[PDB]
Write a protein that binds this ligand. Structure first.
Ligand code: BCL
Ligand code: BCL
Ligand code: BCL
Ligand code: BCL
Ligand SMILES: CC[C@H]1c2cc3[nH]c4c(c3C)C(=O)[C@H](C(=O)OC)c4c3nc(cc4[nH]c(cc(n2)[C@@H]1C)c(C(C)=O)c4C)[C@@H](C)[C@@H]3CCC(=O)OC/C=C(\C)CCC[C@H](C)CCC[C@H](C)CCCC(C)C
Ligand SMILES: CC[C@H]1c2cc3[nH]c4c(c3C)C(=O)[C@H](C(=O)OC)c4c3nc(cc4[nH]c(cc(n2)[C@@H]1C)c(C(C)=O)c4C)[C@@H](C)[C@@H]3CCC(=O)OC/C=C(\C)CCC[C@H](C)CCC[C@H](C)CCCC(C)C
Ligand SMILES: COC1=C(OC)C(=O)C(C/C=C(\C)CC/C=C(\C)CC/C=C(\C)CC/C=C(\C)CC/C=C(\C)CC/C=C(\C)CCC=C(C)C)=C(C)C1=O
Ligand SMILES: COC(C)(C)C(=O)C/C=C(\C)CC/C=C(\C)CC/C=C(\C)CCCC/C(C)=C/CC[C@H](C)CC/C=C(\C)CCC=C(C)C
Ligand SMILES: CCCCCCCC/C=C\CCCCCCCC(=O)OC[C@H](O)CO
Ligand SMILES: CCCCCCCCCCCC[N+](C)(C)[O-]
Ligand SMILES: CCCCCCCCCCCC[N+](C)(C)[O-]
Ligand SMILES: CCCCCCCCCCCC[N+](C)(C)[O-]
Ligand SMILES: CCCCCCCCCCCC[N+](C)(C)[O-]
Ligand SMILES: CCCCCCCCCCCC[N+](C)(C)[O-]
Ligand SMILES: CCCCCCCCCCCC[N+](C)(C)[O-]
Ligand SMILES: CCCCCCCCCCCC[N+](C)(C)[O-]
Ligand SMILES: CCCCCCCCCCCC[N+](C)(C)[O-]
Ligand SMILES: [Cl-]
Ligand SMILES: [Fe+3]
Lengths: 240, 281, 300
């Protein structure tokens, strides 16, 4: 029972407690577990639910307490394919429009994210005094091409994360005059075009629109990004 | 059982093999074809480990050790008890590791996310194959690989390193260590920075990412950014493992002496090679 | 199929002077130049930097530590610049010999100078520690950074200060030299019976490997959901989006459990601090309590 033996035994005890604490802290979202019908599941595991904590959100946006009564706060157009649990749920309609699967979006607050001063974090570059393209290819003016090698529109602006100084969306003007936002992480700026492999030229119009030409809400961002990523699975039939 | 938000994501599709045949979950785990493969290799490898323990004569996990074939066997097969079990278990381990990676890819596709995770995991797989496959083959014998034992495989590291003096002087080994240390340094700072902003002083509102940026400009005059730090961490950890496999694939293959002798090209440059004084003068 | 490792189109705007909170704006520098080079991988903006009394003290004290080692190296080189560059990595400023015990009366060339350098290094590191605390405090942030830094200081304090004192000799400290401190590390293991059989050394390694494991996981995870704006982690904590949901579900489906956007950073901060926390323990017990970790190991 020398001091080294006690030190290492103590540490293993301390580490077990640490793991228990880390795991409970990681159960503040998505718990308690549900059955596939939404009811609470009988087996929740050995770790209990953590006790509620409160974040005070800045800019008077209220407070968040987690854990708390969870809610999708939106309809889910899916149906069971098996009486037993563990099987996929199939879309009942159009999954890209119904926002399910890889096209899923979360009902976030219908407000724009704000920077440390209370201003919109993301703005079109035409409304961002001083911002410009400093390196790489400037996509403004370039044609936008879909996975069907057809042109859907042209880039008319860039929406910028001002605190980070980072391009986050391309604003693309469609053949009908309207515009849509395209995540920067899903496009491929080339010399003579912008290529989007996730969508076909005739699926750009289906991207969710924003209600203000100079700001985008967190809900709008989730609908836009989810739709585009969903195209990888759901637009593949016409992908050359 | 599901998470409260999970159902909408549990749609069919995204597989690479078998269509909808293995497109289902067992509890939280997604199966898929490569989930079945992973189970098959893993179960078969574990049986052979238990079998090697019976041949060895112990069930104490601290003593079990599956050794590769003796050097005299070269690169040919060996009998089960004389290194064959190591050979088969190495195949099973490779099969499981690769199956695991391709399962992750199937999951990336069903979730419509990027493939960065299985791509990063492949670097760890590469380091494993560097030590059990690439380097043994280039040296001409499976025996140069390391044994599968909790403690015997530490002895292997110690024996292999001291065959070349102090392995510290392996220049690629230094670089790999630098990325390992820097990575843990970056991981600690990143975790602390987010927590410091999400959990500010008492009587304070949650901070913003601008605060995170300002904190680091104040501290060291530069902030890499929320996206940049995740690029960086991925980079530091993969570079660490890349130069690990590099510092071993060259040991015993193109370099055979003590690694301290490698630094002589600097010391013995014929112009200052004789200037008296200093350490080497 | 864009991967988001390097920025495709850099954008630049009016420099960000940063949050104010209770920072003393007198001690902030001006803004430095933008770096297109860094813009490909991260933010291009350099500066401003905060420079208070602790920063200045840490800076000056750290440079004195540096210059002390420097002149000793020029002295070992016989003041010859050619010899200096050749043997740069072989030079070493070593602590006093065991004869001097914990005395400060070692002549400069027999450990006296190592003691002066260590003093400066001691002031520089600890004043820098106070700097990480007050910078967070001035902005109203938690002190997680200062506490994580303590874990690194712990191992450094053990290696150069706490253990040598418990051993009763400054000669047990580490020398200042590129190669010489590698050699010190090798002898430390041989003397104490193979550190591979020190349990806290093995733990320290599990967390070092685990830090690379976890950061590859988290970095790769965030880039894979950056198409949903996943890197904006503070707002995902306040308002879970589809980025946090897909990231959690990937790992739940892969290995059976998952983290939250906030909780993954508690895994990370602990994975990393446990490296130097366990390691400093293992070094402190070596020679003070246990002489031969292999032999000690065979009894447990
Ligand atoms: C932990 C056991 C040993 C040790 C073993 C090793 C080994 C082994 C290696 C290093 C390496 C390095 N060590 Mg050492 N090193 C120790 C303690 C120290 C201390 C200290 C405060 O005690 C310092 C300042 C250093 C400094 C350094 C650098 C010269 C170099 C890269 C560090 C790094 O990744 O930084 C990250 C920080 C920033 C990027 C900033 N070591 C202790 C005594 N060190 C590597 C090297 O290149 O050596 C030539 C290397 O291979
Ligand atoms: C006396 C011993 C020698 C020495 C000899 C060696 C030798 C010999 C080697 C190293 C290697 C390494 N050494 Mg050295 N080294 C010494 C001193 C040091 C010191 C130090 C402070 O003194 C440091 C920091 C290091 C650092 C390192 C790393 C750069 C590297 C190990 C990481 C690696 O390759 O990961 C790579 C990661 C892996 C191999 C993991 C792969 C995992 C696989 C894909 C998945 C496994 C799944 C698992 C079975 C599933 C379990 C499932 C359950 C659910 C849990 N060495 C001394 C001088 N060192 C090694 C190296 O570079 O290897 C390539 C190596 O072989
Ligand atoms: C990397 C360069 C060297 C090497 C050098 C060292 C040194 C030096 C040390 C270890 C240590 C360990 N090594 Mg080793 N090790 C290597 C290759 C491996 C491989 C492999 C398949 O390639 C595996 C699975 C292991 C496994 C292990 C663990 C027993 C232990 C802690 C690792 C850890 O937490 O990592 C980080 C990963 C995590 C935190 C995630 C969780 C991983 C868990 C812990 C893996 C358990 C694997 C299990 C014991 C074996 C398979 C079980 C099957 C059911 C049969 N090593 C190569 C040959 N390894 C340390 C120790 O104490 O050993 C006794 C130690 O000091
Ligand atoms: C022959 C060599 C021995 C051995 C001897 C030792 C010794 C001796 C030590 C280690 C230690 C460690 N070894 Mg070992 N090690 C061996 C084999 C291995 C192997 C392997 C593959 O076999 C591996 C992976 C490791 C890995 C490790 C790490 C887990 C651990 C270092 C933690 C760390 O982050 O330190 C890096 C962090 C620090 C040094 C803290 C520094 C913080 C300070 C405050 C910062 C100074 C800043 C300064 C001012 C510089 C300014 C720079 C600015 C840019 C200006 N060793 C063999 C058996 N090892 C350490 C440990 O804890 O062991 C239990 C240790 O002391
Ligand atoms: C490349 C950067 C770092 C990294 C990254 C990394 N690892 C990863 C991933 C990533 C990104 C995953 O996505 C994947 C994962 O899901 O992690 C949770 C994984 C993973 N990294 C793991 C381990 C691991 N990674 C390590 C290292 C690293 N991983 C690097 C430092 C290490 C060490 C030693 O440092 C270990 C031990 C696993 C937890 C997991 C992969 C699990 C897997 O492949 O599961 C399928 C296999 C089984 C279920 C069991 C197979 C059993 C065998 C058939 C028999 C055993 C044979 C074996 C050779 C015995 C060896 C024992 C002795 C050596 C003691
Ligand atoms: C959790 C353990 C890891 C860690 C963490 C860590 N280091 C830290 C911090 C933290 C949390 C800081 O807040 C502090 C900092 O400001 O970093 C940007 C720092 C720091 N870690 C540093 C270095 C460093 N850390 C190391 C290691 C580690 N740091 C561990 C791997 C190493 C080695 C050898 O591996 C080195 C060389 C400095 C860059 C910085 C301390 C600055 C300082 O004291 O400067 C005084 C001297 C002059 C200004 C001259
Ligand atoms: C920001 O976003 C993120 C998340 O969401 C918000 C996360 O959740 C995570 C995951 C990280 C954690 C949960 C932290 C803890 C992990 C650690 C310490 C790594 C080390 C992990 C382990 C030790 C666990 C290893 C476990 C396994 C390998 C699973 C064991 C395997 C089994 C049981 C078999 C697999 C099953 C099958 C093949 C299917 C069944 C087969 C049949 C034939 C039916 C990351 C990275 C992240 O950035
Ligand atoms: C052009 O050249 C000039 C001359 C200008 C130069 O500047 C050249 C200079 C260099 C190239 C510098 C080279 C630098 C190095 C080689 C540094 C290498 C450092 C290491 C390998 C790390 C060693 C650190 C480990 C130790 C032992 C640290 C000691 C820290 C202690 C915790 C402090 C202990 C304090 C003591 C003993 C007493 C002081 C006072 C107290 C109150 C404690
Ligand atoms: C480049 C010119 C100036 C010199 C720089 C000083 C040297 C710093 C060395 C190592 C630490 C690496 C820092 C990386 C850790 C950052 C932690 C983090 O999360 O940062 C994200 C972002 O900054 C928040 O918004
Ligand atoms: C007889 C006891 C000997 C000391 C054992 C050390 C184990 C505990 C280590 C964790 C220290 C707690 N801390 C500071 C990280 O919160
Ligand atoms: C030394 C025996 C310790 C037994 C239990 C230890 C549990 C500690 C876990 C760390 C909790 C982290 N926390 C709450 C301090 O932030
Ligand atoms: C490397 C240490 C890993 C520790 C893992 C412990 C956490 C496992 C939690 C599983 C139970 C969670 N579940 C299934 C109820 O959601
Ligand atoms: C999944 C196949 C990949 C091959 C990697 C496995 C290598 C194991 C060592 C080879 C043993 C076979 N044999 C009989 C030729 O020695
Ligand atoms: C050595 C094992 C290899 C298996 C893991 C490889 C996964 C790489 C990820 C796929 C890349 C596909 N993409 C998106 C680049 O077209
Ligand atoms: C010795 C290393 C200690 C581990 C550090 C873990 C961070 C948890 C401490 C939270 C800090 C809380 N507070 C009030 C200072 O902001
Ligand atoms: C914060 C997560 C911690 C994960 C725990 C890792 C445990 C690795 C076990 C290593 C065994 C070391 N030992 C005691 C045998 O020398
Ligand atoms: C030594 C590391 C151990 C890691 C083991 C983690 C197991 C995965 C989590 C199991 C949760 C699933 N289940 C069925 C219990 O609810
Ligand atoms: Cl300051
Ligand atoms: Fe993060």
């Amino acid at each position: 029972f020398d001091l080294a033996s006690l030190a290492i035994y103590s540490f293993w005890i301390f580490l077990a407690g640490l793991i228990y604490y880390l795991q409970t802290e990681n159960m503040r979202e998505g718990y308690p577990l549900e059955n596939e019908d939404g009811t609470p599941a009988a087996n929740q595991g050995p770790f209990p639910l953590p006790k509620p904590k409160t974040f005070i959100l800045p800019h008077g946006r209220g407070t968040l307490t987690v854990p708390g009564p969870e809610s999708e706060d939106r309809p889910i157009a899916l149906a069971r394919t098996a009486v037993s649990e563990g099987f996929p749920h199939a879309p009942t309609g159009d999954p890209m429009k119904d926002g399910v699967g890889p096209a899923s979006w979360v009902a976030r607050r219908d407000l724009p994210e704000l920077d440390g001063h209370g201003h919109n974090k993301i703005k079109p570059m035409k409304a961002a005094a001083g911002f410009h393209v400093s390196a790489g290819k400037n996509p403004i003016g370039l044609p936008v091409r879909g996975c069907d090698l057809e042109i859907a529109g042209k880039v008319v602006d860039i929406w910028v994360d001002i605190p980070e100084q980072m391009a986050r969306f391309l604003e693309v003007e469609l053949k009908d005059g309207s515009t849509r936002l395209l995540p920067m992480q899903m496009v491929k700026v080339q010399s003579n075009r912008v290529h989007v492999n996730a969508l076909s030229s005739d699926l750009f119009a289906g991207i969710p629109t924003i209600k203000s030409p100079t700001e985008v809400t967190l809900l709008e961002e989730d609908k836009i990004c989810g739709y585009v990523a969903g195209g990888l699975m759901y637009a593949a039939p016409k992908r050359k | 059982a599901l998470l409260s938000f999970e159902r909408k994501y549990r749609v069919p599709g995204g597989t690479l093999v078998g269509g909808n045949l293995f497109d289902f979950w067992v509890g939280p785990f997604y199966v898929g074809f490569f989930g079945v493969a992973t189970f098959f290799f893993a179960a078969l490898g574990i049986i052979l480990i238990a079998w090697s323990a019976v041949l060895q004569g112990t069930w104490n996990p601290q003593l079990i050790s599956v050794y590769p074939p003796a050097l005299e066997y070269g690169l040919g097969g060996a009998p089960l008890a004389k290194g064959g079990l190591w050979q088969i278990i190495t195949i099973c381990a490779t099969g499981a590791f690769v199956s695991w990676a391709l399962r992750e890819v199937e999951i990336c596709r069903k979730l419509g996310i990027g493939y960065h995770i299985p791509f990063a995991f492949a670097f760890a797989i590469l380091a494993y194959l560097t030590l059990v496959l690439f380097r043994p083959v280039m040296m001409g014998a499976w025996g140069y690989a390391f044994p599968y034992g909790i403690w015997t495989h530490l002895d292997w590291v110690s024996n292999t390193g001291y065959t070349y003096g102090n392995f510290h002087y392996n220049p690629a080994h230094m670089i790999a260590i630098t990325f390992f240390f820097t990575n843990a340094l970056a991981l600690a700072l990143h975790g602390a920075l987010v927590l410091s902003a999400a959990n500010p002083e008492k009587g304070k509102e949650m901070r913003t990412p601008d605060h995170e940026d300002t904190f680091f400009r104040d501290l060291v005059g530069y902030s890499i950014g929320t996206l940049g730090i995740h690029r960086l961490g991925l980079l530091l950890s993969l570079s660490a493992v890349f130069f690990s496999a590099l510092c071993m694939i060259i040991t015993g293959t193109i370099w055979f002496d003590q690694w301290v002798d490698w630094w002589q090209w600097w010391v013995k440059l014929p112009w200052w090679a004789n200037i008296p004084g200093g350490i080497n003068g | 199929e864009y991967q988001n490792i390097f920025t495709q189109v850099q954008v630049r705007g009016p420099a960000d002077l940063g949050m104010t909170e209770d920072v003393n704006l007198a001690n902030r520098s001006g803004v430095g130049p933008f770096s297109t080079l860094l813009g490909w991988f991260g933010n291009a903006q350099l500066g401003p930097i905060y420079l208070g009394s602790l920063g200045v003290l840490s800076l000056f004290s750290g440079l004195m530590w540096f210059f002390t080692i420097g002149i000793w190296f020029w002295y070992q080189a016989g003041w010859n610049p050619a010899v200096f560059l050749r043997d740069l990595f072989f030079f070493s400023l070593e602590p006093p010999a065991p004869e001097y015990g914990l005395s400060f009366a070692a002549p400069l060339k027999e450990g006296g100078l190592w003691l002066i350098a260590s003093f400066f290094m001691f002031v520089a590191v600890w004043s820098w520690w106070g700097r990480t605390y007050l910078r967070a405090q001035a902005l109203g942030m938690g002190k997680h950074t200062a506490w994580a830094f303590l874990s690194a200081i712990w191992l450094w304090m053990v290696l150069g200060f706490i253990r040598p004192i418990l051993m009763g000799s400054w000669s047990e400290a580490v020398p200042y030299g590129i190669f010489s401190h590698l050699d010190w590390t090798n002898n430390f293991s041989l003397v104490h019976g193979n550190l591979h059989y020190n349990p806290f050394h093995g733990l320290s390694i599990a967390f070092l490997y685990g830090s690379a494991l976890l950061f590859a996981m988290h970095g790769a995870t965030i880039l894979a959901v950056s198409r949903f704006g996943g890197e904006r982690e503070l707002e995902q904590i306040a308002d879970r989006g589809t980025a946090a949901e897909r990231a959690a579900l990937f790992w739940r489906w892969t290995m059976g459990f998952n983290a939250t956007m906030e909780g993954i950073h508690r895994w990370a901060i602990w994975m990393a601090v446990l490296v130097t926390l366990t390691g400093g323990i293992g070094i402190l017990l070596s020679g003070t309590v246990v002489d031969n970790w292999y032999v000690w190991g065979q009894n447990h």
